[PDB]
Swiss-Prot record:
Chain ranges of the Peptidase A1 domain: 17-328
Coiled-coil intervals, chain numbering: none
Keywords: Aspartyl protease, Disulfide bond, Hydrolase, Protease, Signal, Zymogen
Disulfide bonds, paired cysteine numbers: C255-C290
BP terms from Gene Ontology: proteolysis
Official protein name in the record: Endothiapepsin
The gene coding this protein: EAPA
Family to which the UniProt record says this protein belongs: Belongs to the peptidase A1 family.
């Protein structure tokens, strides 16, 4: 079996992407943020603190005939941006683009942090990293992809994110019409629970390609591309007036600039991120200082190939016995 669901940017800057997911019987549709950087399926629910819910669609397990409380199980998660959520756990039928998993752990949010409350369009997260990162205690739970894997035609899912446009998440198959050229596959380390791979280098605009190993994660749940200080400085050095601002929290550039492209290597292949994808608009409404889409990973401890990089490609997340990542131009 297979699944196919459309993913849509939550705003004019592609800050996050939402994909409709059906939970329970009769179906309750919630717009979840598919996150290849975490392994918890958590939702805003009837159990979420009323002052922390601001316009979200909530999951009401009492109205679902297939919902069952996973007695005693709790979850507690905190993300790289400092945001967090926690609560109890139910099992229920979950469908993504026609692909159904019965008895999926659906972690019901009791408490959410301010960042989640502020995103009225995001009803929760659908974790797609390795199940070893799942926070459910005392019995660790599997992701939607882990649970669907045996029913899938091929144990894969693909991310085809759009630039200021909707995209697609496919499960179980590779759409040969969604990309040009060939897919270049690269090794994945599952040691940290992430889709962790090694980029073979980079180029800035029409500059020479620099062959250097850059360990990083393919993360659909991170908006920007986070790379080592050396690489980020070499990129922003090509933009007149660009600087790193401690007051803003990263690199900013004059909104009047035309950004150069950024190429990253995947084995012997190249993925080009157009300059427009790196523009995240004014830092504040009306400002002439614009936020950069390429930021330093120095404070994070890991390089992150976020949406800025992933949307420039058709990305295959191969969950076979030996997991691999495929990148193709599109």
């Amino acid at each position: 079996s297979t699944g196919s669901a459309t993913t849509t940017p939550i705003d004019s800057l592609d800050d996050a992407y939402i994909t409709p997911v059906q939970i329970g019987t009769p179906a309750q549709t919630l717009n979840l943020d598919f996150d290849t950087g975490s392994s918890d399926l958590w939702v805003f629910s009837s159990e979420t603190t009323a002052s922390e819910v601001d316009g979200q669609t909530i999951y009401t397990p009492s109205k679902s005939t297939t919902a069952k409380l996973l007695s005693g199980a709790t979850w507690s998660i905190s993300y790289g941006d400092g945001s967090s959520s926690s609560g109890d756990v139910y099992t229920d039928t979950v469908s993504v683009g026609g692909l159904t998993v019965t008895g999926q752990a659906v972690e019901s949010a009791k408490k959410v942090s301010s960042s989640f409350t502020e995103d009225s369009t995001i009803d929760g997260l659908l974790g797609l990293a390795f199940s070893t990162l799942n926070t459910v205690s005392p019995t660790q739970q599997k992701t939607f992809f882990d649970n669907a894997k045996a029913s899938l035609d091929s144990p894969v899912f693909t991310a085809d994110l759009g630039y200021h446009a909707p995209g697609t998440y496919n499960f179980g198959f590779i759409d040969t019409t969604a990309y040009t050229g060939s897919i270049t596959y690269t090794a994945v380390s599952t040691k940290q629970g992430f889709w962790e791979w090694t980029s073979t280098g980079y180029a800035v605009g029409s500059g020479t390609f620099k062959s250097t190993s850059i360990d990083g994660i393919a993360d659909t749940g991170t908006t920007l591309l986070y790379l080592p200080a050396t690489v980020v400085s070499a990129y922003w050095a090509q933009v007149s007036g660009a600087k790193s601002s401690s007051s803003v929290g990263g690199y900013v550039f004059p909104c009047s600039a035309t950004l150069p492209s950024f190429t990253f290597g995947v084995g012997s292949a190249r993925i080009v991120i157009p300059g427009d994808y790196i523009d995240f608009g004014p830092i504040s409404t009306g400002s002439s200082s614009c936020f950069g889409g390429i930021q330093s990973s120095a404070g994070i401890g890991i390089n992150i190939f976020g949406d800025v990089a992933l949307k420039a490609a058709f990305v295959v997340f191969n969950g076979a016995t030996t997991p691999t990542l495929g990148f193709a131009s599109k």
